[PDB]
Design a protein around this ligand. Structure first.
Ligand SMILES: CC(C)C[C@@H](C(=O)N[C@H](C(=O)O)c1ccccc1)[C@H](O)C(=O)NO
Ligand SMILES: [Mg+2]
Ligand SMILES: [Mg+2]
Ligand SMILES: [Mg+2]
Ligand SMILES: [Mg+2]
Ligand SMILES: [Zn+2]
Length: 889
């Protein structure tokens, strides 16, 4: 197993200047002919010429049109083609090859493969070498001239990067198209697509240059009507990069293509972005609400890569967060502006503090720029993406919008058309910092530790107020726990956005203030503070840290009611729940351990329940925010706070707390459920494909959250409401009716009804599968067996497999059944999937990420399944690397 180290980066001894490809797609094979116009670089030391090439069948290879002899002049071991140096020219030369590949049977969905009746490539990170020989690394920039040929009836639409410069007929029912893309690019941005694609299109005129850009969105014919929202999202994305960043699209055309089989959400190939269908296609009749924000996010993300990833490119894969963290941050600014709802930012924070904080306290913990890797595929992580996005967002918080925009334009102007590293970005921000601080000695050297240091910092507080002096002090400490990456952790540059709330009237007592904590601890003093304030800390979640606010629940309730910042209100509610959860968890755990015949539980704070009611009853308050306050923190957030977490005891703890609150508020929930109906389910714009109302969708989220609370509670006659809800035209509502009917004898009746509604739309059926998978059913193992036998069968579609199994793994009571049967089931699926798709097999490992945080019996059971998986003789390199790291082996 080869380990790549960040510190070992060295430019290649070779240059590839031009790629000329001929890709000939036939029924049983695809023939790839490639000529590489190459040169010797200044770094060359007379080494062998070694190409990446994985699973290629060689027909022939040549240098300067002289055929090379296998064994004497080259060897090939199905991974590397080695041409011995004595046969390599010492100046400009042509390398040519013809290989055979088999997209029909490429179920790993990397390289060139067949998705239903579409041929499509996926080259990031290491898939171009599965198509032809190359030095397959992102600093090998080249020009591409690509011809694709195929059966015309089967494959009438042919696409690759750049301009279509020729189209031609070929004898025997074939045709070809030539695409020339003269600007340099790395090979992972190469793409090709062939199929019977249908489209929608539009023309966009850029803001400044007034260039006409043709926009095309493509899918299979059956679903082409679902493409309209994606086209609107693409127009929105273009406008936002223009408006916020002053950045226009530089090419004549941009194509988006949906395919059914895709390992992730989408890919930013230059001018030819390729999408999982579930992240491009939607309709009001056949999609749940979540599709609309997903498509906005994923179209936005791939569009923003055209600058941050495609125009400014990566030197090497260790810089991945430089394109991903920066592009996720750009998409977050975009979606926040488009949705104009506070729940957009809260949803990103909710994901970070659950999924990413778990990763960062697990054996898999890494910094956003890792020091080493074995498998490139394994470091497309929530750390690199989502913590990287928060590190990219902290520059904006530190600099403010004006100087942030100045520093970003510095980065773009200086690095456009070139490779770059994380240092290049920090340098550009530093130049703006100097400007902002009016101080050419100011620097961001300490900021670089955000790239190199793993683990989540903990930030804690103490306060003091002197009433006679009108002087308030906030004493702040930061600590990062040592881990396997750094024995000694250093203090970070942590920006702490703060307000001070007057508890008598709820008003702001200071203007906008961002504390710059740069030491292990500091004390920030405020004068002319007329009354003791309640501090509003880390507004907007201003650093990706564990916040220990040291506030009383009375203070947190006042912030929840009266603070101006949505994150601090949401966090203050989170913190009240966490205090309760840890207390009741310990009371239940002691009762279990001590085998008590009777014991007491600490009730939920009554003034907190009153504050929830107060907010729920406020007609002026936000529906999406309301849905967060009635929901306990995610299980994966909670687990970061409990050692040896007994999942049964946590399930009992959550049940008690929800029942305490429902026992007081169910009549309120019911009344809101009914009163929200008219606006939440308004059909006025149901047949307007472009009219998308994120507040209305949040009203449905609140209704569907309330209906789940009422259903679990067996609120009187709520089944009537459930049955009526199953008749709604919105899939968010009628799939919710399946979910919440789990508590009633009508479950399988709704199972059949909603299946019939879902079965004729590929993506809707996947959403139905997810709904069944996450159903709170005592017979869920029997239900999953039925899904396997009746619907999933032997599908190799990643969306199918993820839909059936991943939601179930979040079932706290049942996935973690003490027999280990849930662990056994998911391990069987992982090993089965690994035979044909290692990347999706590794995704299916996600529930094991918390293994060493559970109680000791469940730790043992999970570890046993991971060791069983590790002992499979046919295990992929990707799955083996991942499980060796996760098990500290
Ligand atoms: C987060 C993104 C908007 C794009 C990213 C992506 O598709 N992530 C997916 C997602 O996080 O929703 C995904 C990962 C695993 C399994 C299914 C889906 C894509 O790799 C990229 O960076 N494109 O540039
Ligand atoms: Mg092969
Ligand atoms: Mg405009
Ligand atoms: Mg299918
Ligand atoms: Mg380890
Ligand atoms: Zn990306």
């Amino acid at each position: 197993p080869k380990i790549h180290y960040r510190k070992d980066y060295k430019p290649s001894g070779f240059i590839i200047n031009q790629v000329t490809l001929n890709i000939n797609i036939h029924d049983q094979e695809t023939i790839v002919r490639s000529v590489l116009d190459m040169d010797i670089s200044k770094h060359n030391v007379g080494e062998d010429l070694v190409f990446d090439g994985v699973g290629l069948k060689i027909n022939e290879i040549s240098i300067n049109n002289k055929k090379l002899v296998e064994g004497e002049e080259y060897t090939y071991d199905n991974e590397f083609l080695t041409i011995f140096s004595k046969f390599v020219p010492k100046s400009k030369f042509a390398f040519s090859s013809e290989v055979i590949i088999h997209p029909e049977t490429n179920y790993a969905l990397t390289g060139l493969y067949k998705s239903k009746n579409i041929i499509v490539s996926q080259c990031e990170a290491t898939g171009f070498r599965r198509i032809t020989f190359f030095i397959d690394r992102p600093d090998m920039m080249a020009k591409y001239d690509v011809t694709v040929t195929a059966d015309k009836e089967k494959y009438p639409v042919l696409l690759s990067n750049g301009d279509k410069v020729n189209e031609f007929e070929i004898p025997g029912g074939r045709h070809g198209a030539r695409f020339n893309d003269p600007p340099l690019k790395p090979c992972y941005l190469f793409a090709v697509v062939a199929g019977d694609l249908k489209h929608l299109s539009a023309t966009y005129i850029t803001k400044y240059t007034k260039k006409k850009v043709e926009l095309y969105v493509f899918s299979e014919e059956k679903y082409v009507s679902k493409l309209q929202w994606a086209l609107e999202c693409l127009k929105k994305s273009m406008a936002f990069d223009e408006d916020y960043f002053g950045l226009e699209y530089d090419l004549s055309r941009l194509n988006l293509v949906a395919v059914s089989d895709f390992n992730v959400g989408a890919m930013e190939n230059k001018g030819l972005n390729i999408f999982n269908a579930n992240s491009l296609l939607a309709s009001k009749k056949n999609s749940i609400d979540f599709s609309y924000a997903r498509i906005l996010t994923v179209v936005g993300h791939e569009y923003f890569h055209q600058y941050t990833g495609n125009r400014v490119t990566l030197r090497d894969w260790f810089q991945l967060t430089l394109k991903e963290g920066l592009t996720v941050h750009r998409e977050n600014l975009f979606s926040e502006e488009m949705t104009k709802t506070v729940t957009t930012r809260l949803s990103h924070v909710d994901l970070l503090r659950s999924v990413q904080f778990l990763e960062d306290s697990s054996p898999l913990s890494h910094p956003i720029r890792p020091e080493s890797y074995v498998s490139m595929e394994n470091f497309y992580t929530t750390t690199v993406y989502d913590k990287g996005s928060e590190v990219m967002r902290m520059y904006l918080t530190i600099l403010g919008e004006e100087y942030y925009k100045k520093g970003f334009d510095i980065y773009i102007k200086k690095n456009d058309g070139n490779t770059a590293t994380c240092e290049d970005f920090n340098y550009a921000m530093e130049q703006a910092y100097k400007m902002k601080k009016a101080d050419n000695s100011a620097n961001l050297n300490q900021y670089l530790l955000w790239f190199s240091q793993s683990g989540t910092p903990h930030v804690s507080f103490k306060y003091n107020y002197d009433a006679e002096k009108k002087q308030y002090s906030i004493h702040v400490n930061q600590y990062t726990k040592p881990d396997e990456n750094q024995k000694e952790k250093k203090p970070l540059f942590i920006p702490i956005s703060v307000g001070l709330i007057n508890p008598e009237n709820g008003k702001e007592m200071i203007s906008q203030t961002t504390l710059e904590l740069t030491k292990e601890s500091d004390t920030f003093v405020f004068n002319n503070i007329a009354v003791k304030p309640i501090p509003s800390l880390f507004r907007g979640f201003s650093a990706p840290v564990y916040i220990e606010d040291q506030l009383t629940d009375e203070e947190r309730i006042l912030l929840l009611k009266y603070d101006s910042d949505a994150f601090v209100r949401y966090n203050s509610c989170t913190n009240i729940y966490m205090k309760q959860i840890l207390m009741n968890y310990n009371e239940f755990l002691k009762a279990k351990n001590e085998k008590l015949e009777s014991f007491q539980l600490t009730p939920v704070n009554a003034q907190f329940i009153d504050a929830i009611k107060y907010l729920l009853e406020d007609p002026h308050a936000d529906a999406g925010f309301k849905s967060y306050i009635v929901s306990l923190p995610q299980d994966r957030y909670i687990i970061n706070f409990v050692s040896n977490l007994d999942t049964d005891v946590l399930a009992d703890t959550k049940e008690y707390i929800y029942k305490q609150i429902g026992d007081k508020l169910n009549d309120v929930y019911y009344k809101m459920f009914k009163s929200l109906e008219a606006k939440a389910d308004d059909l006025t714009y149901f047949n307007d494909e472009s009219h998308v109302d994120f507040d209305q969708m949040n009203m449905r989220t609140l209704r569907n959250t309330l209906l789940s609370l009422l259903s679990k509670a067996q609120y009187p006659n709520i089944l009537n409401e459930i049955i009526e809800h199953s008749k709604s035209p919105y899939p968010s509502n009628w799939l919710t009716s399946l979910s919440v009917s789990a508590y009633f004898d009508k479950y399988f009746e709704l199972y059949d009804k909603t299946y019939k509604l879902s079965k004729d739309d590929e993506l809707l059926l996947q959403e139905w599968l997810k709904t069944v998978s996450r159903s709170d059913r005592k017979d869920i193992y029997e239900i999953l067996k039925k899904l396997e036998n009746e619907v999933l069968k032997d599908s190799k579609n990643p969306n199918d497999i993820r839909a059936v199994y991943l939601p179930f793994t979040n079932n706290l009571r049942r996935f973690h059944d003490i027999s280990g049967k849930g662990y056994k089931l998911i391990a069987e699926v992982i090993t089965k999937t690994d035979k044909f798709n290692p990347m999706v097999a590794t995704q299916l490992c996600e529930p094991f990420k918390l293994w060493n945080k559970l109680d000791t019996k469940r730790q043992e059971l999970m570890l046993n399944e991971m060791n069983t998986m590790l002992q499979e003789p046919q295990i992929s390199n990707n799955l083996k690397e991942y499980l060796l790291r996760l098990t500290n082996k």
